[PDB]
Write a protein that binds this ligand. Sequence first.
Ligand SMILES: Cc1cc2nc3c(=O)[nH]c(=O)nc-3n(C[C@H](O)[C@H](O)[C@H](O)COP(=O)(O)O)c2cc1C
Ligand SMILES: Cc1cc2nc3c(=O)[nH]c(=O)nc-3n(C[C@H](O)[C@H](O)[C@H](O)COP(=O)(O)O)c2cc1C
Ligand SMILES: O=C(O)c1cc(=O)[nH]c(=O)[nH]1
Ligand SMILES: O=C(O)c1cc(=O)[nH]c(=O)[nH]1
Ligand SMILES: [Mg+2]
Ligand SMILES: [Mg+2]
Lengths: 311, 311
Amino acid sequence: MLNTTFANAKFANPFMNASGVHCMTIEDLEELKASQAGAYITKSSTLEKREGNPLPRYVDLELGSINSMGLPNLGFDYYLDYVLKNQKENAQEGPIFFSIAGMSAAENIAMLKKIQESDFSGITELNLSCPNVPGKPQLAYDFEATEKLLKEVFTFFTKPLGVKLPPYFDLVHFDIMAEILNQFPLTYVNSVNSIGNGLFIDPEAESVVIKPEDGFGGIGGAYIKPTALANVRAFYTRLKPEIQIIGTGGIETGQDAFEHLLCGATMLQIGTALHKEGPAIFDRIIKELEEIMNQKGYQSIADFHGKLKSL
Amino acid sequence: MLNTTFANAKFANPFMNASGVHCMTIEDLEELKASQAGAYITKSSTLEKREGNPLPRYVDLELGSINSMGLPNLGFDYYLDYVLKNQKENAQEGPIFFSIAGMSAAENIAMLKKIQESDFSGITELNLSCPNVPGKPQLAYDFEATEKLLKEVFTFFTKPLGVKLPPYFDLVHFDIMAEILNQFPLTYVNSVNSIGNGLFIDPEAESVVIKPEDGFGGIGGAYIKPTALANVRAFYTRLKPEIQIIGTGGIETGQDAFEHLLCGATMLQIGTALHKEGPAIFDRIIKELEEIMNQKGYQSIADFHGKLKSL
Ligand SMILES: Cc1cc2nc3c(=O)[nH]c(=O)nc-3n(C[C@H](O)[C@H](O)[C@H](O)COP(=O)(O)O)c2cc1C
Ligand SMILES: Cc1cc2nc3c(=O)[nH]c(=O)nc-3n(C[C@H](O)[C@H](O)[C@H](O)COP(=O)(O)O)c2cc1C
Ligand SMILES: O=C(O)c1cc(=O)[nH]c(=O)[nH]1
Ligand SMILES: O=C(O)c1cc(=O)[nH]c(=O)[nH]1
Ligand SMILES: [Mg+2]
Ligand SMILES: [Mg+2]
């Protein structure tokens, strides 16, 4: 019932882990491969291995989560070597996704060049929430910087490429970004990354709950579904059909998944809920979505994909 | 215990309604005057009376609310006439707040000029989430446009003035805005307005819940407290002491109020929760905050104001 076609590949279902959750090590990845997830993505990597920020840097919240991991990862070469070896085993239907988040534009270009030159036949995801010039907003909030980077990337990168974007909150911003993205042969857009720089407080202790950035961190979970759905829908109605969408943000139940698909998302990623529940979540949410579809008499995602009704 | 000093005026407590909620008519305003609210603010007005968007345009949600009211209001003259007459009765400790959200820069300047010329001795709040040039983001997301407007405003406006701002999600944005705002003799900054363009879906009906903007609307309530607290705190540590802060966003319990005050807010505004509960909320939340203070042995907000601890 959930069979999905994305980036010209076939997947058993649309579910995937969100980058950063349960995908740090080869062991994490193997557990994802073993789960019911239709596909999985690696932790955003940088050129060098990164320890990340001081703990505590992640906290479960009643309505979601807050984090400031600091891009901890085992380095580009570690992930590239892993995906290259699994690619050869052909023991998995559907390509693996490879996320990169260079500490700089030069680092992103360098990693993209290595992926291009390698035999990697999978899908690449460029995290545009990656660092940028000192007195500059995250890359994706700097429209000029974003367009400049993408133009250089597409002068040489011919393999499947998608971009992970932060949430937008103004319709003109969606228009500007859509216009920038539509000029490129992008495989997809993934909305959204966590809601940036939120703050959570322990009232009793009268203090923040994470050590880095004075307690400020990305927000995920139920807090952000309204924003995540909006971004998925806003891009669905603005992007050229060539560019598909991956919906990410506040997905925990089959109903949440149903809502993202209704908005136009083709693949779905689970972050916070997966972090709390573990790989077993995929089997649960898959069954939940199928039950919803059964009650409505739907046999394929195509029966409702992108059919969100306006009043 | 909650006595507060703000904009050089004295208030029985920091609580107020958030603009747009329970402040449309003179009758609404009188009910706010009659409640325990330490102060109140009028609905953002425009030069002409506005009917607002088609219904349904506001919906209560389990975790907050979504709206696209479309600035319905009775017109500038109606509100100005009201506050001028109440000002004379001296039957209220602390000035009334007057919100304006011109459909254009010319409209904001025109209203500010009328307030300046009038005998209004209260406080004015400029809603920088007001409309802007066609292909331009809301005013407050257009740093250049915002600075230009404020410079013109301060070439003539000498009365107390505060600005209502939308939420920001990047630290560099807070730096840029703080730098722009610190150059003016502003009375205060009010963070935050609703999280813009969120989307809520009724999965059974497979449709949005508000009629305008294809269902997209500002999000308020529990969904946004993490973002609201972050904005209050981020500005508290960047604004010159001359500019105080009004905390708005996800305030429903004494604990929520405690958190905003801990961040640096001096006055507090309640939107969503007030819309659901009615003016009686002020008596409840006041008691809730006082109980929290009593348990901690605090006798004045000064005992913890802005004392949020980092790890
Ligand atoms: C602990 C943690 C680490 C994350 N790491 C990444 C990362 O390396 N790259 C990326 O693009 N997104 C990262 N994200 C963001 C997620 O991919 C996802 O966009 C976010 O958590 C919103 O989804 P959710 O509501 O299901 O959590 C991370 C989120 C969390 C909570
Ligand atoms: C129905 C409604 C109308 C609103 N109207 C205004 C308005 O005219 N001007 C303004 O500055 N903010 C307006 N707001 C935003 C609030 O003042 C407040 O910033 C927002 O609801 C976030 O607070 P909350 O979490 O307590 O709801 C409105 C919010 C709602 C729900
Ligand atoms: O590694 C992290 O801290 C991180 C990266 C990213 O893109 N998003 C997030 O929420 N955390
Ligand atoms: O009147 C409205 O629609 C409105 C104005 C504003 O500033 N904020 C909001 O959430 N709604
Ligand atoms: Mg599997
Ligand atoms: Mg009163």
